[PDB]
């Protein structure tokens, strides 16, 4: 009566003892690759009909940070796919209102989305998969689900996922992550894989008649084609966990007729503003472009570094939440300023380099900080505590650079380590 | 009995990468295991600073710079590294009377030029730099402890000598662990000075045994022991130093702590030869680092060393013969970065098609496969020649892909970042 989860075997895998909050187990579990040190990762992308806002930035920056930790810090090999939903009810509606083609609208806002991601120093994925370029593959994917008897065709030419038939199989469970969230249909919970199109909507040919992909089928199709029958990581905001992500699991399990398409499903918490999710529907949003006319990429990234990725966060506007971010950014700027100059202007001809007790004490705190930050990253990507550890180290380095005769090589190594962590955070100084 | 034993560190609680390194203590490739956690305490012998450094010195310090970058940047070990400067030496004393400037001023001039040459070659400074002239008091205390443990004796002239026979007698000590077969005021001719009674007109320091100078080897045991302690994860130097210098360091340090294993992994770089002979100040066959740098770049010089396994000897053919290949490789890397940055800059998201094609998948497969080949090369005793070849082959295929295929912008960026990562590990700058 309750979904089971199979932890990957550790034999032959890279083992870091990283633990992650897995929505499939609703618990922190040890992260174990399916193969070697490889991570196949699919993340749901935006629906490109309007500008992106600070809530979208929170999800994509948080998972950018996680990806940098996985790759730059732990040395996993990440193969990442992000889709672009450039066919959608919202795009169609917006495009008639503005009297422009569906493709021209979608391409503009896809362009602005990637520009906003680049402005926030978010890395592009390995592959970008647009629905409009995968419609043929989606049709073939649906044909296989029908052939496995997990979907049916209505008279109008739609295709619906057959929840009851899927559940019946002992190898399949429907709504693995939110079990409790559950006329032409067998049962009302059945969802469309293929929607019969009105003659005035954009549409594509199919064995069942002119139509469009359903809301969820594109993500199973694209991830399955490129990454295959087992994903190490699948990610998105928490609102997508059900119906969207649970439905992806059902579609993909039905396609491959197996029991676990995704090993680790990661859900970022929502950014709220004045207690409510930042949302285009609520008209309480701040565009990323507007945010960047007031704050820098570094300051915005610090905002997200200070909030655990899988917890919700409150954003207080009019600069309230950003006060701390600006202070931290300023302290990092001034630290780098001093250490860079002290290194550049250091004179080996006239210095004394005896390794003193003050040098030893700073070095001990330095190596200790490396170990604290390691534990924070293993603890479900705990960037708030890792950032605080960096701040504490910087406080002591600043004292050391002011009074003690300075060990040039120790400061260079410290600068390189803090640079390494800031690269992992996505900060640029 | 009659053969030195070696104790591999326990793996429990340690970072385990399956890295194997050529250990001179075992004369074999053995798995590298830290003494503690992911930490590596590393001492490397430094230059004697009386004249300019040459290309042979560059090979040793660049090779161990590459190894350090692999350990830290690639494997994420935590390296605490110490390098000494021998600024008191018979050669410095003699050279300073010739040059008629104080011995301190001469030594500091050539130490400064050594570090400038290292920076020009993108060699990272160590955590600590230990000059003999700043450690004489500690050296005296170190010798006092060795005498107190009865492993050294004082001659009437005021010199102190290490007592090889007394040291060997102990069942926990073996003399010449790494080159066992290389073995009037002294008990036995193999005894070596820890403290030298001072000659007239030489610089000198006070001690309980009279005015003198450190012996040839005692500074490295003293400095490493003071900063790093009673067990070093790595000790390094050129192969010529393995005996007597490094074996004598082991004996001094074991005598000070009265234990059996001061160094877990002893790594020796091979010599750079020129026309069949070690590049050497004595043979007057040397090329200074500065003269090399007026003809070639840091990248080209580092590629020269990347092409030769760090612990094997290499031949250097002068007049540009060995550098022809290095210049070609450096040019192909410069050109690769030019091309890929142009393709990225000129990529247009509004007119492109981003379907993940068969050509995209084949390049990605080669990309991930290259990551695993390079991983195995680094685990195989820092095999940079084969790692560099793997990067060259990947670049050849990326160049083909950028010329004809519609390009996956994100895939090209990710590949560029990985090659950047490996090039940072090599010390190359593009
Ligand atoms: N940095 C890395 N690059 C490429 N592959 C890696 C890396 N780290 C680990 N692996 C791969 O992970 C697998 C197991 O990791 P490892 O820590 O070596 O455990 P094992 O003791 O099983 O070899 C191996 O197939 C290895 O190639
Ligand atoms: N306020 C918010 N806070 C955090 N993440 C959000 C917020 N709003 C949307 N997201 C996330 O941003 C991503 C893109 O959302 P959106 O552009 O609305 O398209 P869709 O959610 O339909 O894929 C999704 O993972 C979504 O969960
Ligand atoms: N990148 C790193 N930074 C700091 N410490 C590390 C790092 N990698 C490993 N360690 C430390 O090295 C030791 C080896 O841990 P590991 O073998 O990964 O897991 P386990 O603790 O099960 O042995 C641990 O004490 C760990 O704290
Ligand atoms: N031709 C050479 N090739 C490689 N390494 C060399 C060469 N000549 C000297 N070295 C190494 O350079 C380092 C510095 O040597 P040197 O300046 O002579 O002082 P010392 O021998 O006291 O270290 C040593 O590790 C030595 O083995
Ligand atoms: Na079932
Ligand atoms: Na939901
Ligand atoms: Na003995
Ligand atoms: Na020798
Ligand atoms: Zn999706
Ligand atoms: Zn030495």
**Do the Cβ atoms of A130 and B74 come within 8 Å?**
no
Residues preceding chain discontinuities in chain A with C to N over 2.5 Å:
182
Q: Which residues contact B361 (CB under 8 A, 6 or more apart)?
A: A226
Q: Annotate B313-347 with b (16+ C-beta within 10 A) or e (fewer).
A: ebebeeeeebbeebbebbeebeebbeebeebbeeb
* Alpha-carbon dihedral sign for residues A92, A93, A99, A100: negative
Residues B421 and B282 occupy one common structural domain:
no
Q: Whose CA is nearest to atom 10 of ligand 3?
A: B38
B4 is a domain residue? no
Of A298, A315, A332, which marks where a domain is finished? A315
B150 is a domain residue? yes
B3 is a domain residue? no
* Alpha-carbon dihedral sign for residues A417, A419, A422, A426: negative
Mark the residues whose beta carbon lies below 5 A from ion ligand 9: A 44, 219
B380 to A95, B29, B386, B418: CA distances (angstroms): 59, 9, 10, 20
Rg (CA), chain B: 25
Cα–Cα distance measured from residue A304 to residue A317, given in angstroms and rounded to the nearest whole number: 15
Obtained via which technique? Answer: X-ray
Which domain CATH number covers B53? Answer: 3.40.50.620
Q: Domain of B411?
A: 323-426
Cα–Cα distance measured from residue A207 to residue B245, given in angstroms and rounded to the nearest whole number: 82
Q: Whose CA is nearest to atom 16 of ligand 2?
A: A46
Residues A301 and A328 occupy one common structural domain:
no
End-to-end CA distance of chain B: 54
Cα–Cα distance measured from residue A110 to residue A48, given in angstroms and rounded to the nearest whole number: 5
Residues B207 and B279 occupy one common structural domain:
yes
End-to-end CA distance of chain A: 53
SS (HEC) of chain B: CCCCCCCCCCCCCCCCCCCEEEECCCCEEEECCCCECCEEEEEECCCECCCCCEHHHHHHHHHHHHHHHHHHHHCCCEEEEEEEEECCCHHHHHHHHHHCCCHHHHHHHHHHHHHHHHHHCCCCCCCEEEEHHHCHHHHHHHHHHHHHCCCEEECCCCCEEECHHHHHHCCCCCCCCCCHHHCCCCCCCCCCEEEEECCCCCCCECCCCCCEEECCCHHHHHHHHHHHCCCEEEEEEEHHHHHHHHHHHHHHHHHHHCCCCCEEEEEEECCEEECCEECCCCCCCCCEHHHHHCCCCHHHHHHHHHCCCCCCCEEECCCCCCHHHHHHHHHHHHHHHHHHHHHHHHCCCCCCCCCCCHHHHHHHHHHHHHHHHHHHHHHECCCHHHHHHHHHHHHHHHHHHHHHCCCCHHHHHHHHHHHHHHHHHHCCCC
| Count of Cβ atoms closer than 10 Å to residue B106 Cβ | 22
The token pair that represents B69 in the structure block: 């970058």
DSSP secondary structure string, A251-304? HHHHHHT-S-SEEEEEEEPPEEETTEE--TTTT---BHHHHHTTS-HHHHHHHH
Residues B297 and B353 occupy one common structural domain:
no
How many residues belong to chain A?
Answer: 429
Residues B196 and B245 occupy one common structural domain:
yes
Environment class of residue A408 by beta-carbon count within 10 Å: exposed (0-12), middle (13-18) or buried (19+)? Answer: buried
Place of tokens 């994509």: A60
State how many domains chain A has. 2
Is any ligand 3 atom within 6 A of the Cβ of residue B16? Answer: yes
Residues A363 and A378 occupy one common structural domain:
yes
Cα–Cα distance measured from residue B192 to residue B188, given in angstroms and rounded to the nearest whole number: 9
Q: Is A95 helix (H, G, I), strand (E, B) or coil?
A: helix
B220 is a domain residue? yes
- Out of B37, B77, B79, give the residue to mutate to test ligand 3, the one with the largest number of ligand atoms within 8 Å of its CB: B37
Of B252, B283, B316, which marks where a domain is finished? B316
- Out of A49, A55, A308, give the residue to mutate to test ligand 2, the one with the largest number of ligand atoms within 8 Å of its CB: A55
Q: Is A105 helix (H, G, I), strand (E, B) or coil?
A: helix
B14 is a domain residue? no
Q: Is A12 helix (H, G, I), strand (E, B) or coil?
A: coil
- How far does CA B33 lie from the centroid of its chain? 18
DSSP state of A232: E
CA of B231 to the centre of ligand 2 (A): 54
CA of A311 to the centre of ligand 8 (A): 62
Residues A351 and A216 occupy one common structural domain:
no
Q: Which of residues 100-129 of A touch B (CB under 8 A)?
A: 107-108, 110-111, 114, 123-129
Residues A86 and A111 occupy one common structural domain:
yes
Q: HSE-up of A212 (CA within 13 Å, CB side)?
A: 19
Which domain CATH number covers B373? Answer: 1.20.120
Angle at A9 between CA A7 and CA A11, to 5 degrees: 160
Cα–Cα distance measured from residue A56 to residue A62, given in angstroms and rounded to the nearest whole number: 10
The phi and psi torsions of B23 (rounded to 5 degrees) equal -95, 120
Cα–Cα distance measured from residue A190 to residue B94, given in angstroms and rounded to the nearest whole number: 93
The token pair that represents B36 in the structure block: 């503690």
| Count of Cβ atoms closer than 10 Å to residue B198 Cβ | 18
Residues preceding chain discontinuities in chain B with C to N over 2.5 Å:
183
The token pair that represents A186 in the structure block: 């067998």
Resolution of this deposited model, Å: 2.1
B262 is a domain residue? yes
Q: What share of chain A is helix, strand, coil (3-state, %, to 5)?
A: 45, 15, 35
Q: Is A200 helix (H, G, I), strand (E, B) or coil?
A: coil
A11 is a domain residue? no
Nearest to B368 among A77, A125, A359 (CB): A77
Residues A48 and A186 occupy one common structural domain:
yes
Of B316, B332, B357, which marks where a domain is finished? B316
Residues A278 and A407 occupy one common structural domain:
no
Cα–Cα distance measured from residue B250 to residue B253, given in angstroms and rounded to the nearest whole number: 5
- Counting atoms of ligand 1 from 1, which one is nearest the CA of B74? 1
Residues B128 and B258 occupy one common structural domain:
yes
A342 is a domain residue? yes
Residues A339 and A205 occupy one common structural domain:
no
Give the count of Cβ contacts less than 8 A between chain A and B. 97
Q: HSE-up of A151 (CA within 13 Å, CB side)?
A: 30
Cβ–Cβ under 8 Å, residues B323 and B300: yes
């Amino acid at each position: 009566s309750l979904p089971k989860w199979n932890q990957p075997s550790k034999e032959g895998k890279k083992i870091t003892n990283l633990f992650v909050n897995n929505s499939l187990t609703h618990s922190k579990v040890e992260f174990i690759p399916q193969e070697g040190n490889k991570i196949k990762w699919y993340a749901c992308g935006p629906t490109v009909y309007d500008a992106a806002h600070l809530g979208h930035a929170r999800t994509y920056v948080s998972f950018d940070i996680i990806r940098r930790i996985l790759v730059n810090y732990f040395k996993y090999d990440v193969f990442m796919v992000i889709n672009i939903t450039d066919i959608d009810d919202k795009i169609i509606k917006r495009s008639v209102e503005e009297k422009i083609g569906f493709t021209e609208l979608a391409r503009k806002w896809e362009y602005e989305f990637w520009e906003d991601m680049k402005s926030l120093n978010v890395l592009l994925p390995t592959a970008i998969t647009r629905v409009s370029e995968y419609v043929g593959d989606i049709v073939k994917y649906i044909e296989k689900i029908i052939e496995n008897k997990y979907a049916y065709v209505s008279e109008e030419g739609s295709v619906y996922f057959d929840i009851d038939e899927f559940k019946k199989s002992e190898k399949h469970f429907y709504a693995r992550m939110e079990p409790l969230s559950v006329k032409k249909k067998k049962n009302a919970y059945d969802f469309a894989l293929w929607k019969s199109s009105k003659p005035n909507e954009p549409h594509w040919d199919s064995p069942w008649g002119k139509g469009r992909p359903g809301w969820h089928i594109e993500c199973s199709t694209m991830a399955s084609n490129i990454l295959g029958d087992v994903l190490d990581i699948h990610s998105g905001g928490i609102d997508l966990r059900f119906p969207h992500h649970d439905n992806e699991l059902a579609q993909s399990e039905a396609f491959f007729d197996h029991s676990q398409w995704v090993n680790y499903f990661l859900h970022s918490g929502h950014l709220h503003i004045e207690g409510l999710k930042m949302s285009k529907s609520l008209k309480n949003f701040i565009t990323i472009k507007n945010m960047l006319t007031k704050y820098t990429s570094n300051q915005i990234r610090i905002l997200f570094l200070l909030n655990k990725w899988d917890n919700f966060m409150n954003y207080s506007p009019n600069g309230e939440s950003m006060v701390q971010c600006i202070e931290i950014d300023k302290s990092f700027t001034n630290f780098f300023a001093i250490i860079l100059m002290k290194i550049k202007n250091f004179d080996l001809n006239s210095c004394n380099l005896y390794w003193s007790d003050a040098d030893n004490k700073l070095n001990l705190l330095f190596r200790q900080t490396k170990n604290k930050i390691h534990e924070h990253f293993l603890d479900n990507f705990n960037t708030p505590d890792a950032l605080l550890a960096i701040q504490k180290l910087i406080t002591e380095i600043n004292i050391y650079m002011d009074k003690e005769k300075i060990q040039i090589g120790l400061l260079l190594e410290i600068k390189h380590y803090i640079n390494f962590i800031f690269d992992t955070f996505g900060l640029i100084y």
